[PDB]
């Protein structure tokens, strides 16, 4: 099995039937006290974990989703799991806790106001990756920071190869810590940008990180990918798009065909084709977990 | 008993460590993109209802919730009504639905916006206030829209003496329904700017309004309020606040106040007085009703604002 270390997270996406501007008052200190009517809500299911254990579900694959949810809200995403056959077993909730999540409104206008609340993400640390059972490949995304830091020690005390992908929580990263990381993890994946931090941040040469893996997984996005392994460099060329929806997902989606390629029997050429596929066939979707695709659509688009 | 007709709702309070007037200008033009962290979040007991009958209950009054839950998350309420002695008999539940919940975030200037999912008080309206029994006074505040309506045109038929609190259900309302309200009505309270919009949507004036009701309660703030009654005009002093901690249910608590005072026969000023006591009571905590003063301490306190002991006629 797949062990999915990651965030998970609600995005709450409530739309003001109304103009913001037109709710601030004139008082001597510019009063706003707004409330209005949210009853269409839109619950988009998010967070890293759950963006590449429905990638891989998806594809056949047996995806373990290893994260932290709120009490308060948790519901929702686990009758979600059970309803897509997903393994709640190291899917934590923890009391008096919110889960990770994005408030994002929109009025009339399409003037934005975003807070994002943490939430349960920030204990994901109480999930200890070594504890677990016949897992043969994980992969440590972005996710609170002790948690990211946990998971590659006990990975591989555990001796489990993983895929270790800081994203977005990279900028927490310091010389040392992401250098240790590096050295533990068996994959890396990337953007091309970040791949640049990486280096800039440890001091060391892509060279340098290549040698202490099995695989530099840079994403390029829409100019494809590329795979640095022993034996050399993969090109991996960017998937045609059926339409360019909503871009949210899609680096999710290219790791849930990732590791796909790595716990069954395909080379690193065929691996990040199946990645860069996934990436294309979210795009043409809104949100991160709405396009559905069946198996035998995804090998036909392979060919 | 006072019967208390408003929404039931667990509050979500994030606080966001800047000020929404930096970002939020009606002169400005570009497309607002405000993206901040809400390091916590705060669950809370709230809702009209919730609220005013906390306070009207802290003050030995006899408060019945009239208002909606849902069954997926009601319990916790429930729990609580019961632990404050606060009768459960108009609190109905609804399957398969979510209890409203508000989204509330609060700034630096305790400026908010709030985003509220009303889910099972959409259905507020299958309860109805001309069964309930013994009611001597009612509230029909903020609610699912046709809760509100039916509220006020079956107290009105009953013969309950009602305060109509529109709130933010303001919006909703048209001319006409607002009009027939304020007509049904006995009593109305709103804050400075919403009887503003009363008085546009209406196309009455605040003069209009006040001759359409026994009185009409306008809240100040900080700067107290206003009572407009048959005889006159009282002019109600703030309290300063022990300290100031958060703003939500201020108003509810008010409201709770005003509703004592009607009941045990006090005059308009000692009604507004009390009323605006129990705002400053409730602002030195956080929540709507985390505040817990005994009636004894209710007293000292209007004693040392006002400079008499609030008294029934």
């Not at 269409?40 to 998806?58: D, K, Q, V």
């Not at 003037?111 to 043969?136: L, Y």
């Amino acid at each position: 099995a797949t062990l999915i270390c990651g965030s998970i997270a609600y995005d709450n996406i409530m739309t003001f039937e109304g103009r913001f501007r037109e709710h601030i008052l004139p008082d001597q200190v510019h009063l706003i006290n707004l409330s209005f009517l949210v009853p269409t809500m839109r619950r988009e299911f998010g967070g890293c974990a759950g963006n590449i254990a429905y990638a891989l579900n998806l594809l056949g694959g047996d995806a373990r989703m290893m994260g932290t949810l709120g009490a308060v809200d948790a519901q929702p995403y686990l009758d979600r799991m059970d309803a897509l056959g997903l393994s709640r077993e190291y899917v934590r909730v923890l009391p008096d806790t919110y889960s990770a999540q994005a408030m994002i409104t929109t009025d009339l206008d399409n003037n934005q106001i975003t807070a994002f609340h943490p939430g349960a993400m920030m204990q994901s640390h109480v999930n200890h990756a070594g504890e677990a059972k016949d897992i043969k490949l994980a992969i440590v995304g972005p996710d609170g920071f002790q948690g990211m830091v946990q998971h590659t020690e006990e990975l591989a005390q555990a001796g489990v190869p993983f895929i270790f992908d800081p994203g977005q929580g990279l900028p927490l990263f310091d010389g040392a810590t992401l250098r240790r990381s590096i050295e533990l993890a068996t994959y890396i994946a990337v953007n091309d940008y970040e791949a640049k931090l990486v280096c800039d941040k440890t001091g060391w040469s892509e060279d340098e990180i290549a040698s202490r893996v099995q695989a530099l997984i840079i994403t390029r996005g829409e100019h494809g990918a590329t795979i640095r392994h022993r034996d050399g460099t993969e090109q991996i060329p960017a998937v045609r798009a059926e339409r360019v929806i909503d871009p949210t997902g899609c680096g999710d989606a290219f790791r849930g065909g990732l590791l796909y390629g790595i716990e069954h029997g395909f080379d690193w050429a065929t691996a990040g084709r199946l990645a860069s596929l996934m990436g294309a066939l979210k795009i043409a979707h809104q949100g991160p977990q709405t396009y559905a695709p069946t198996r035998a659509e995804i090998d036909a688009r392979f060919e």
